[PDB]
């Protein structure tokens, strides 16, 4: 079972950018990392900390990884998966997005 839903097209997420995304009730976080076609979605939201957009963060490399730190304090989260290097003991929700004709979508309930 698998709802890949439309977001929007690529073009609208600018070059390594994050945008907020609706799944149903769940925010997920588009970070598009790259130029290319690769984006990654992960949880919006944390639930240790509780930063209500993720979207709101620099991505910055470490260990040749993508991570996106959130400046409201020093939390990064991994984009490859979702290990958030504070939250390693549980990692966040993780959702898969493809560009389909240009177009973002986003697959969850796993």
């Given at each position: 079972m698998s709802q890949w839903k439309d977001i929007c097209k690529?073009?609208?997420?600018?070059?390594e950018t994050g945008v907020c995304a609706l799944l149903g009730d769940e925010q997920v976080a588009i970070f598009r990392?790259?130029?290319?076609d690769q984006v990654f979605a992960i949880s919006?939201?944390?639930?240790?900390?509780?930063?209500?957009?993720?979207?709101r963060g620099l991505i910055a490399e470490h260990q040749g990884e993508l991570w996106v730190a959130s400046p409201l304090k020093k939390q990064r989260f991994?984009?490859?998966?979702?290990?958030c290097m504070e939250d390693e003991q549980f990692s966040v929700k993780h959702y898969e997005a493809r560009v389909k004709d240009g177009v973002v979508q986003l697959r969850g309930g796993s």
């Open positions: 690529i073009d609208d997420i600018l070059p990392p790259y130029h290319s919006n939201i944390d639930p240790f900390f509780e930063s209500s957009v993720l979207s991994r984009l490859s998966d979702g290990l």
